[PDB]
Amino acid sequence: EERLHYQVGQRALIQAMQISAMPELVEAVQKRDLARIKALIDPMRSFSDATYITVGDASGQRLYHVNPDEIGKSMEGGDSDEALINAKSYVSVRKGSLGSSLRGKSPIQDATGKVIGIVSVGYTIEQLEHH
Ligand code: NA
Question: CB burial class (10 A; 0-12, 13-18, 19+) of residue 4?
Answer without folding.
Answer: exposed
